[PDB]
Structures are given as structure tokens and as C-alpha cells.
Design a protein around this ligand. Structure first.
Ligand SMILES: Cc1nc2c(CN3C[C@@H](C(N)=O)CCC3=O)c(F)ccc2[nH]1
Ligand SMILES: [Zn+2]
Length: 140
């Protein structure tokens, strides 16, 4: 589990969104595994607006933050899980690192801010849904 809290937005994995998220929906995209809902309180996270391909992510199944090198956002084939059939997920970045299904939502960040959240995994790989192209998170 986990979310990004930027401005009056809450960014979560679409497959983990709650009824309150769906009832206060701003934007969702199944192909990216992302959903954004509105919040009453202002959040403290800042979104990275950069080209970094190194950063650090939080792994709840180890209670640890790990440094990683990750690929550029791309269209990657992801195996079937409890939440999606086997399909192509867009704007996904891969790294070598530990992840279990409940690790989804952990933040990946660089010196510029939040880069994305854990969305996929297995066999010593971890995949992150990028948010750096969602410029509208910084306003309105
Ligand atoms: C064996 C294994 N499968 C893992 C998944 C699979 N997965 C893919 C998600 C997606 N975005 O398609 C939907 C939810 C989900 O559980 C992880 F996300 C993380 C670690 C994993 N280890
Ligand atoms: Zn950066």
C-alpha cells in the first residue's frame, strides 16, 4: 500500500483505490495502473521533473529503502496477477529489486522529488509507474 500526497491530490495504484478515491475521482488510467483522487488537506510530496534513472524506493516487505537504477518509462508486458490479466502496461520503469504484491504504493524518488510508485514485481524485479509527465499534479 501507499500513496503520493501532492497539493490537493492523492496518487495511488488504480488496483488499490478505495471507494472514497472513486467517489472523489480526478483521473484514472488502467493501462498505467494509476488513479488520482482529491483531498481536503494539502500534501507534502513534491513531484520530480527530471531525467533521472537512479533513485531510491521504499520496500514495505523489507522495511527498507533501496537505491536502484531503473529503465526509462516504457510499454512492458506484465504477467497476470490477481488484479490484471497478462497485458502491456504503459509508462512503466523496471529495476532489479525485491517486491511482493503488497509493496505496491511504495515511493520511488530522486534528489528532485517523487518519480513514481511501485506497481509490478517478481523474480528480483520491481516495476514503477512513472508520474513525472503528469504536469497537472503541480497546479489547480
Ligand atoms: C510474483 C509477484 N507478482 C507481483 C506483482 C504483480 N502485480 C502486478 C500489478 C500490475 N500493475 O499489473 C497488479 C497487482 C500485482 O500483484 C507485483 F505488483 C509486485 C510484486 C510481485 N511479485
Ligand atoms: Zn531527478
Amino acid at each position: 500500500s501507499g500513496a503520493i500526497y501532492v497539493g490537493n491530490y492523492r496518487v495511488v495504484n488504480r488496483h488499490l483505490a478505495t471507494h472514497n478515491d472513486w467517489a472523489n475521482l480526478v483521473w484514472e488510467d488502467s493501462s498505467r495502473d494509476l488513479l488520482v483522487s482529491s483531498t481536503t488537506a494539502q500534501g507534502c510530496d513534491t513531484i520530480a521533473r527530471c531525467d533521472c534513472q537512479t533513485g531510491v524506493y521504499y520496500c514495505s516487505s523489507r522495511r527498507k529503502h533501496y537505491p536502484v537504477s531503473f529503465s526509462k518509462p516504457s510499454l512492458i508486458f506484465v504477467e497476470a496477477s490477481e488484479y490484471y490479466p497478462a497485458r502491456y502496461q504503459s509508462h512503466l520503469m523496471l529495476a532489479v529489486g525485491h517486491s511482493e504484491p503488497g509493496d505496491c504504493g511504495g515511493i520511488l524518488r530522486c534528489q528532485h522529488g517523487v518519480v513514481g510508485i511501485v506497481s509490478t514485481g517478481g523474480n528480483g524485479l520491481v516495476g514503477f509507474a512513472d508520474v513525472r509527465d503528469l504536469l497537472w499534479l503541480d497546479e489547480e
